[PDB]
Design a protein around this ligand. Structure first.
Ligand SMILES: [Zn+2]
Lengths: 7, 96
């Protein structure tokens, strides 16, 4: 539940 | 009508929609949790009222597509493919 990784 | 989300990742994981709000995302509070690190913690909501399943993207980081088209809100149908992060969910919507 880390920051979402940007795709 | 019954509506089930089918995670198309090989896992066979499914989620049957409840009436009202269904949150899909990576967060612990989501009704259907995807660990995909490109899925937002609160990624999308599907509202189900027994007849209509209305998807809404929740201002997600990477967006939501239905049948490969970017969407904000979308009325779902049987067989629709929802893409979020690198995950795909098949909508299974069947009248009794
Ligand atoms: Zn079907």
């Amino acid at each position: 539940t880390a920051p979402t990784e940007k795709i | 009508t019954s509506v089930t989300l089918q995670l198309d990742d090989g896992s066979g994981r499914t989620y049957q929609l409840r009436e009202g709000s269904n949150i899909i995302g990576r967060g612990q509070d989501a009704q259907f949790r995807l660990p995909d690190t490109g899925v937002s913690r609160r990624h999308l909501e599907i509202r189900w009222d027994g007849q209509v399943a209305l998807l809404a993207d929740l201002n997600s980081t990477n967006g939501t597509t239905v049948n490969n088209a970017p969407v904000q809100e979308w009325q779902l149908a049987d067989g629709d493919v929802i893409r979020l992060g690198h995950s795909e969910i098949i909508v299974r919507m069947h009248p009794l």
